[PDB]
Amino acid sequence: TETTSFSITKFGPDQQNLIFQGDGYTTKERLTLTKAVRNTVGRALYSSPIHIWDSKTGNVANFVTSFTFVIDAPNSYNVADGFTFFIAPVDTKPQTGGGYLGVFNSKDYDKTSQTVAVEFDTFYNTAWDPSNGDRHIGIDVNSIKSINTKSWALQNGKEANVVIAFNAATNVLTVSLTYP
């Protein structure tokens, strides 16, 4: 049996158990992935690898993560691109920016990507996003095209709490966002 757990209630300026990529850094006790500035990507990874399954036994792990995040736009109409929680290979590195959320490089399914992400997508990219143009939560596996989506109305500058849990026995991934 293996377990990994951690919590960070407040982020400090030297948060050495995280790996920062792009412009992500910690400031005013927050993890800042992007400032309100054009064309940037920020990522932050937990420094320890996690053993999500074992080939020798076939066992798969359960996990739960909860986090509070905020998106702050100028106004609630010109807001982009969104945010992701992702699971990727140990050596992951930023992929395309903009509507690919730094995590995918095609709308086409790519088995070499090996990453699944829960996105909170704030901008409609006609080419792969829900046709109704709404902002939405989606589960992405190897592509920026979600396997499923749920519309969400962004409360600009509000703190949002999310819980994501994976249950290995039923293979179910549940995502919950709440604005309190």
Partner: protein, 47 residues
């Protein structure tokens, strides 16, 4: 106001045995500040 989504995602088919987890956020021609205020994670793998 809560929003819940659930799906079956047989993780063993898509990701390696060892993975790293984290967050990503981007901007393009339009933009927004993206920030995380706290984070808790727990995983367990029987063996």
């Amino acid at each position: 106001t809560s929003y819940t989504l659930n799906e079956v995602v047989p993780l063993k088919e898509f990701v390696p045995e060892w993975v790293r987890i984290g967050f990503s956020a981007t901007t393009g021609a339009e933009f927004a500040a993206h920030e995380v205020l706290s984070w808790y994670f727990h995983s367990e793998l029987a063996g």
